[PDB]
Amino acid sequence: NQQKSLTLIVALTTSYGIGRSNSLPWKLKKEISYFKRVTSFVPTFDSFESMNVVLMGRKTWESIPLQFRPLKGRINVVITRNESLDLGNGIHSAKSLDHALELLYRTYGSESSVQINRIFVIGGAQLYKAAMDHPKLDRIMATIIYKDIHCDVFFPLKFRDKEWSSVWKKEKHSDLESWVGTKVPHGKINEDGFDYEFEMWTRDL
Ligand SMILES: NC(=O)C1=CN([C@@H]2O[C@H](COP(=O)(O)OP(=O)(O)OC[C@H]3O[C@@H](n4cnc5c(N)ncnc54)[C@H](OP(=O)(O)O)[C@@H]3O)[C@@H](O)[C@H]2O)C=CC1
Numbered sequence: 001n002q003q004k005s006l007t008l009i010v011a012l013t014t015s016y017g018i019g020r021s022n023s024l025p026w027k028l029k030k031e032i033s034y035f036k037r038v039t040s041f042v043p044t045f046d047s048f049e050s051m052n053v054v055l056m057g058r059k060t061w062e063s064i065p066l067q068f069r070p071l072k073g074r075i076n077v078v079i080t081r082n083e084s085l086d087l088g089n090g091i092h093s094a095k096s097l098d099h100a101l102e103l104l105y106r107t108y109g110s111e112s113s114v115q116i117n118r119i120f121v122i123g124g125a126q127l128y129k130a131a132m133d134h135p136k137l138d139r140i141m142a143t144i145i146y147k148d149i150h151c152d153v154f155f156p157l158k159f160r161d162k163e164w165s166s167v168w169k170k171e172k173h174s175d176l177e178s179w180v181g182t183k184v185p186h187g188k189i190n191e192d193g194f195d196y197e198f199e200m201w202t203r204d205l
């Protein structure tokens with residue numbers, strides 16, 4: 001069930017809004033290419049053997065443009081109690097976060113030609129709530145959108161605010177680039193009228 005740390009990845013407004021109408025309220029081309037880059041990166045040496053894992057809630061799974069599904073070059077797991085009849089040509093299903101981690105550890109042992117590198121939780125709000133409570137979650141890759149966009153779904157813990165500042169710390173940009181293994185734009189990007197910026201936050205386990 002245990003081993004590796006969990007990483008959460010999220011794009012949020014300064015008001016912690018994360019979606020509206022079971023979609024993103026924004027169309028941000030470069031934000032999705034960042035997403036793709038970060039969740040896909042494995043060191044070159046390790047590249048033959050290893051892949052990353054993306055964990056998501058069922059409604060997020062349903063939200064991804066059918067075209068984009070499943071997430072290429074990543075082991076995809078959908079968390080669902082109502083697993084009943086998942087539909088996937090080797091996309092896994094699991095009844096909880098910890099059940100997912102036991103599944104991967106069983107499926108991808110030292111037998112397996114495929115080994116796991118990093119595990120990411122990619123949403124939605126319900127799964128984020130479970131991962132924020134999980135004793136192995138230590139890192140948050142956030143994209144901050146500097147607009148009060150109308151949302152109906154909110155991130156569950158205000159990790160950037162004063163009350164959490166002795167636990168969650170923002171890392172220097174050079175530490176961001178090192179962890180994701182590529183240059184990343186420092187400061188604000190403007191696309192389709194939205195200003196936004198890339199951050200990395202960590203906590204001690
Ligand atoms: N801004 C961003 O970065 C992101 C935003 N989003 C947005 O989030 C919204 C969807 O979030 P939300 O409705 O909360 O949905 P989720 O994607 O988290 O899916 C919820 C479902 O997943 C299952 N599930 C989730 N957590 C658990 C758990 N801990 N244990 C068991 N089953 C679990 C259940 O499946 P079942 O009911 O089948 O049993 C539940 O109804 C959309 O608006 C989407 O666009 C999503 C991702 C990223």
Ligand SMILES: COc1cc(Cc2cnc(N)nc2N)cc(OC)c1OC
Pocket residue numbers: 009010011022023024031032035060063064065068121122123143
């Ligand atoms: C890859 O396409 C999508 C990706 C995501 C998740 C996601 C997107 N960006 C960031 N920074 N973190 C995330 N977890 C969410 C989506 O819609 C809810 C997507 O549809 C485009």
